[PDB]
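Job type: complex structure
Entries:
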Amino acid sequence: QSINFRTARGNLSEVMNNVEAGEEVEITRRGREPAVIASKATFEAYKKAALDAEFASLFDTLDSTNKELVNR
Amino acid sequence: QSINFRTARGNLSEVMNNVEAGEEVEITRRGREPAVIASKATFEAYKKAALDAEFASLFDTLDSTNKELVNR
Amino acid sequence: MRHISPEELIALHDANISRYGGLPGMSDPGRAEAIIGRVQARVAYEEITDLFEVSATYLVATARGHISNDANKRTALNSALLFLRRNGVQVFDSPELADLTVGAATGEISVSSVADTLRRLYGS
Amino acid sequence: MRHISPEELIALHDANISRYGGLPGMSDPGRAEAIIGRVQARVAYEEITDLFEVSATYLVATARGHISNDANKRTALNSALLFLRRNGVQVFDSPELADLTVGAATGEISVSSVADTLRRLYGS
Ligand SMILES: [Cl-]
């Protein structure tokens, strides 16, 4: 769930198998904000939810003109 | 965007600054399925959108009892 | 077994308030943490494997756990059935679910009786 | 400056056809790649820093880019305003957006005019 910079470097191949198994590991760092490792399938599934939501708001905001343009 | 787990091992500190800048890096392994490193900020936002959609369809499924419970 | 986290439980509660009604901005994360804590603790203590007994626990713990001043019964029912959905069990609305939740809150219906009702409805 | 990928432009088109109407399953990736390719190229060549010019480019490029035989004016408009929203500009519906988009698509309104109208509506 949370490992340090160094531990990842040395046990990266293990972090892969955890991630592949279904875990979402955080990578903390002494300097700046941290990062997260996840499997591509889950990441991309979350990215699509976000994009889908983004489109929903855009379409809600522009609902009238969107409806109108269908008939032009 | 796509790198092997060896180039990651040696250049982990580079991957961090890339990730924090705005990049979303894939990590491949030959014979295995890949992972993705990304900033915790963007990952969590994606996860949250996934979750919103998850609640929205449950609420849809149970829309009738939910409305009824408000008045009790 | 997939569970619901304290931060997910609050998010659910907040999301329900927005959609159906109630006073927003009040959800206590300590109550969310305490509600989930009970559910995990009960599972470990009684070594519960039955999804419907666990589902019943989310329902009773939440309906009596007062995350905030409103919408607790909804958050209870919804988290119960979200847990079932998350663990492969197909869920759907039923006229029984309102009374069931009210009974759990009032103490009139025990955790096992809730588990029985949920099993009858969604079991196989 | 945040941009829209080819793969997003397609997702946007399919999402729009589902919601508002049109023939689905017909979006050409090479067309999406060509539309974004043109926007990105114009930006570099002309060294465009103005967000509303870039928006206007997305709008004309997509409107005349023929991603499929349907909903190209809608994708054009939405893509342009998605760009704006993504770069921190607040957007909203306006009575003149429909006319704008149609004249864009037919060549009667050029990129600069579309830019001036977006800059008027959404730029301080
Ligand atoms: Cl309630």
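Summary: Chains C and A do not touch (no CB pair under 8 Å). Residues 79 and 106 of chain C are 18 Å apart (CA to CA).
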